[PDB]
Symmetry: C5
Subunit: 400 residues, 5 copies
């Protein structure tokens, strides 16, 4: 259009993109800043990097870019590319990307009175502290700090507007709680002029269904199966294998959790405490199994049963767990031989009785330790999994 | 030639690559948008990112790029590179690339009457929701939203043309169903003017031959092998090893599945349900094996077989399974000696008879549990596999 | 130099890089396009992407870039950088890269008669189909498609020159069979305008020495070792651990092999078929071992051994296998006692004889199944490995 | 603003960005170089690179960019982008990045008296030596070197300012000790002109809590558990499975841990020494277990007990460990029968006595080696772990 | 200053950066090319690339960039950025990075007489053959090729200067032997002109301490531990589990090791063949163990030991290793009864006396195969380890 061509020719006369567009040079240029959250794309726990998809919103008033629509009837707005008009240099101080600025530079929409609009999209990789103390029942607060880089507080009056979440797409792993913001001005060692900035905090809660189904339940089941050694008879000759195999099979779970966790030294993760407790339980299970095995394969006439062992394992625990304790010269020569044979059988009977009593003691010890270990593992698991805050909320929101 | 040089000099005279090429400024500009799918690069289930290879197609009429063929006999079309003529700022809204734009800028072919064609190729990484509820017999819909960033509905009339699939190359893992399009207008918090956009939906059906033959069949085979613990005689003393080793060998499969699957908590994957069911099956098998072994190694004199247990197992289940139940003074001194020996032998015979009864009871329990576990695992696996929709279609389209 | 400075000043006078350097504007400009292969870098089977080091070759005649050597002594060639002259817009069609054009823009060498040479280097990532049916005895063909993006047939006709492989460097993993091409031609539905393009097919053969020595021989050896369970006597007590451990090893081997293979569902690969056959063989061996162990530990009084099993195992297969089958009143009181003892001893002897007969039957079954399984595994391995059409060529080239 | 428009127009008049802003051309331009540390993002031990977030700080004086604020009341500072002003070419010498200069070019703030202030941000990847001799108890010294690439000391003399640590964000893994600066002058063979440069040495101390919890304690506990084979009785038939599975688990642990450390060959790391010691201890325990099992299953008449081992073990070692050492004509024919039976039983009991002797000797050897290995493991672990120069500091600052 | 401003204005008067700065247009421009190695960043065996930190030294004489130093006092050198003056187009021929040329474009220093120095830094990823045959005792020779892309001997004749290693920083894994250069020509068929090229070969020796300690010593120790299977008595019942567990562990060891090596089919690597030999050693040990177990459990009532075995396994082989060979009517009825019992005992003793011979034969085989397998393992390990060249040099330089 001829009007469009004339307006574009007239709007660029003696225009310097290096100057701040203010009618008076002694007042700051008010700029309104806001962002629109679109998607939380990634939360890296190991590298402590948060990846989001946002649209920055910048608005200000330009004094030289004004015209009367009477002389230009058809055209009401004008768009300008990068490098042709003045734009604020607003960056992200918290950036964690090789290019310190990740914004696709689009056009600038202008009023017929000089109201510039800037909506640059882009995927932002910011570095925020990730707390894994109560993993996987944790809520994270990651900050996004925005502000002008080279304009002080006397030339650029930054003003914050509320973030817009009307186009937010659920992540499916993180539940968004909110995104407040606040404006503050700081002093830097470079200069003696305040530099206002706008900080947005993103609060999200991890959904625990997947982790609960894939890490907590299998460990519970395997630890429960590890108690099955306290039910096998000692004569089966398989007791050590169960404990060893369950220890081996939980080593891989420990290694997996270690590989998915950041190498932080600020606190002990709740899952780490759980796995250490389970390791301890299995270790003492194996120790008790060895003790029972060495009690059951006792050598008759190899020692004397201590009186304390006798009383404690035959009159107290047997009662408490309702145990039931099991229970012419030729003729002369013939007689000598038959008494010898009978005496040999009698000694065999005494030896087998001693062996039976030793085996009964081993069985009593085994059952008592079974009960104690079951109580201990239930208590430890319940306490560890209930210690974390908002665990009831997480359960009621995800599972039920 | 001279005519080409003259035309090129004439066309760029007083041309502003900023203004919209419309004869009347009030009327909008009609731009036809279309897509040409070529290939599907990858479908990142873990990162919810879809990579494609497409050719965008745009067409519009330029008012100033017109000439007469008679005055320039040789030439009929001209081509302009980026930054020399006006082009629409159409870009993909749902972009997962580090840079928000992935198009490769090429030339713009021009009619003799002002028709511009623009076909920029590129590889697009668009973030689309991936549903793994019915993995691997699943169908995924991914959207591609294209629209002008800075031009409203009063300036650009973004029409839609049907997507073209003729140069499409089959992926070999995904089966294309179709790619329809739909145009709509939306309002944004920035501005009081609608912004039309064109959305293309891609429907792909996963081919399940590889995933089936690599995950389902081995798991079924190992689950069936885990039932052999009920055919092993108890005297071999190697029942528990089979169960614990198949438990390990399926835990590694669970690890692989956790590796390939994402970490969403929206739903429980079908493969996760199947693996959990197999886990419970093997755990219950190990528990039953422990019970059977503790039945087999029953200490005689250490207890009495309950009458209810006998009537349940010995003469009821054996009937059900049709199993047979197995089975001068000197001469005096010698007389009591041989009497003592004979009495000892008789007591040994009674003890071995009791032990044989206990062993038969253990065998009966083993047979019952074998039958029950076999029927239960068959029913569970059939139900879980057949619960998925279009499972029969996927089978008949892949295996047949 | 004075002369070359004057020539450079003169040549760029009234020059328009947008203009096509022809003399009549109606006759298409002939461009000769060829290739120069340097090295094959990587063949990504998982991503279906081929990376190569390639030098392009272009040659056209420029009408305006001519001069008389006699007027400019010494100056015989001139060179121009990107953008200062006209260049064909030839780029890879089936490219797989974030930035579509993977070329380095060097200078253009122009002779005194207007002949332009252009050799842009670069590393090209191309998405080509990768068949995996006969992996690792496979030969792959990957296609490279070039051609002008915008210039048609009446303006720019493409001519082919033979590909150059003089500078080729051996890969060490792929054997270059050759690289032919075809100068195709295409017509549209509007106009009789031939659109030409040049395509190059790279045919390579995989060297099988590494894959063979690292996959096939270890698996064959381990499968052969898995057959030793049949030679193991039942009384040892380790007939199940051997089979289950080789099963674990085979499962790990499949898991590690499937990490380098594509997830295509086009066809079942040869290596997958071989692994499936090995798994079936091992599972059947475990089942047979369970049956043999069940036979070995048979209750002497648990039943009667069927006459069919008698006349088969102890009669036919035993002869076939050439196995030898092993095999005053007080005086009356003492008489009764010794008769009782003797009767007990005789019953023990009969039970021992029955157990020995059962054990011999188990041994016969074990040996027969050993022979059958050895034949099965040898036949299956030979048949699976001999099905590759390139197997003889591979074994004659790589190994020999 | 009119005043700033006029000032911008007047300042760029006859200005050449290629010219060094001095007044005599023979005096070096004083430049002050500092550095503001934000956070340490990564320390890659495998690649030996360090990633940090750093704000550069350069300040100098410009002779031409001077104006009187009386004629321009509102204007007090001006800003210029890259390419329109002279900037020092300060680079990172020991950089490790695809682009040798990973800085973001921002505006240059200029005061009214010609004072410049340039603060470009960025993420820097520098190659620094990583010493893993005392891993995980490490203190690292990574150096950053800066300096003009082309400007010499006679034209550009760098000056060092103290590094600023305000605004530092704690890593959570690495503890920052400090970052001291040093300005060094290096001469050439040309001429007596300095070539000053500024170097900063970042000193970090690894926080040894995560590694201590995940590697040292689990391996210590597993090594302690591996000693339980000595308390296991030899009759259980599990004295080797425990040791072999512990050895397998520990070698898996070592091989997986090896994925973290680099392949350097300048020293033997502490963790490698500790793992090797554990390997040796477990192997020797397995050897001793084999020897003990050989002692236990000795043939009753396959040999004779040597006097030397008899006196050394049964006499001296029992004293040490305080172990109690356990333990009508037919009448003639009947006489030889009963005498034969009696002497057979006597031979059986003497063979049993010899077997008991061998078993007791095996038990004594087992106890002695248990004591020896219990001493050895503790001594080796303490000695290896106490060799770190800062072990006490690390423990007292990470645990207490 | 004024003088340098005037000089900068004067030098760019009628300057064309597209022409060689010669004075006759026929004499080639002599260009000196050198190198400055700083660090070897990484050597990749998988993808066969070499990444280094390198400074490129260039120097030539410019005819136009000259001035009288008297007329411009104080000014001695001038600097020009990329694009403002002519620069040689020298680039790496055999590159491996995505951008074919990776050099940071810095300024060019020009003296008063017209001498140009150009030292662009960068990180170069080359592509060189990596010989893995003698792994990990490799000595590599990676070539770097440099040269003008378009200019030839008529225009630009390259020269060579010795590479600079004064700034070298040791890698820690690779020992640098040296880096020699060479200047070579290449005559074309058309034109008898030189085509100078300068190539540098970097020779590095791998440090074997880490690889030895982490791969060779553990493998030898594990093989020695597996060698203990022959000392274990057969009565334990653990002779198979130990061997199979070691086999599985070392198989996973080899599979893990194979990941850090390329799939090159040009030679069989030393580590690969060593692991193979260990594989056959362990497999044969398992086979021998199976044979020994079969001999130990021979049926006493089965076949008869052949005379060949009776001599060779009992006399000859026991002499070879010196193992001593271990070794009224009622009266009639009672007489017949005791005769029967004594005859049964005598038959039992005779039957048992045959199993001792089989057990001694098993012991003889165990000892013989222990000796033979130990000798075989020692010989094979020594031969494979010492076969590689410069093994003595490597061990002396690394371990001492
Ligand atoms: C413009 O900015 C510079 C910042 O360095 C000012 O220089 C400093 O000014 C203060 C007070 O005048 C002095 O105390 C410092 O010593 C100065 N720094 C140096 C390195 O000299 C400069 O004064 C400012 N000029 C104007 C007109 O405001
Ligand atoms: C539709 N566009 C994309 C998002 C907002 C909107 C817009 C409006 C004005 C300037 N830029 C962008």
């Amino acid at each position: 259009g001829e009007f469009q061509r004339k307006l574009y020719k007239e709007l660029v006369k003696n225009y310097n993109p290096l100057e701040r567009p203010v009618a008076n040079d002694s007042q700051p240029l008010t700029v309104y800043f806001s962002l629109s959250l679109l998607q939380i794309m990634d939360v890296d726990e190991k590298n402590q990097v948060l990846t989001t998809n946002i649209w920055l919103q910048m608005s200000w008033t330009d004094h030289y870019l004004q015209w009367n629509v009477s002389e230009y009837p058809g055209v009401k707005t004008v768009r300008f590319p990068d490098g042709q008009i003045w734009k604020p240099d607003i960056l992200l101080y918290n950036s964690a990307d090789e290019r310190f600025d990740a914004t696709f530079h689009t056009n600038v929409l202008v009023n017929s009175s000089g109201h510039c609009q800037y909506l640059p999209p882009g995927i932002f990789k910011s570095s925020c502290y990730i707390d894994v103390r109560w993993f996987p029942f944790d809520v994270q607060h990651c900050k996004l700090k925005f502000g002008s880089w080279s304009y002080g507080g006397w030339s650029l009056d930054l003003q914050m507007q509320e973030a817009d979440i009307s186009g937010y797409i659920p992540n499916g792993e993180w539940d968004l709680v909110g995104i407040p913001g606040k404006r503050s001005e700081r002093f830097y060692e470079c200069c003696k002029e305040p530099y206002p900035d706008v900080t947005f905090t993103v609060t999200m809660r991890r959904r625990t269904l997947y982790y609960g189904l894939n890490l907590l339940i299998p460990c519970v089941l395997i630890s429960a199966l590890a108690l099955l050694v306290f039910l096998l008879p000692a004569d089966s000759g398989e007791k050590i294998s169960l404990g060893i195999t369950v220890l081996l099979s939980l080593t891989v779970f420990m290694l997996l959790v270690a590989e998915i966790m950041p190498a932080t030294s600020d606190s002990v993760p709740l899952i780490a405490q759980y796995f250490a407790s389970t390791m301890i339980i299995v270790g003492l299970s194996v120790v008790v199994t060895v003790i029972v095995l060495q009690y059951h394969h006792h050598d008759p006439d190899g020692g004397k049963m201590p009186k304390w062992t006798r009383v404690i394992l035959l009159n107290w625990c047997a009662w408490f767990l309702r145990m039931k304790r099991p229970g012419d010269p030729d003729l002369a020569k013939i007689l000598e031989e038959v008494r010898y044979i009978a005496n040999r059988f009698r000694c065999q009977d005494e030896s087998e009785a001693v062996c039976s009593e030793w085996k009964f003691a081993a069985c009593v010890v085994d059952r008592l330790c079974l009960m104690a270990f079951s109580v201990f593992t239930i208590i430890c698991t319940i306490g560890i999994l209930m210690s974390a805050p908002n665990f009831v909320e997480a359960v009621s929101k995800d599972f039920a």
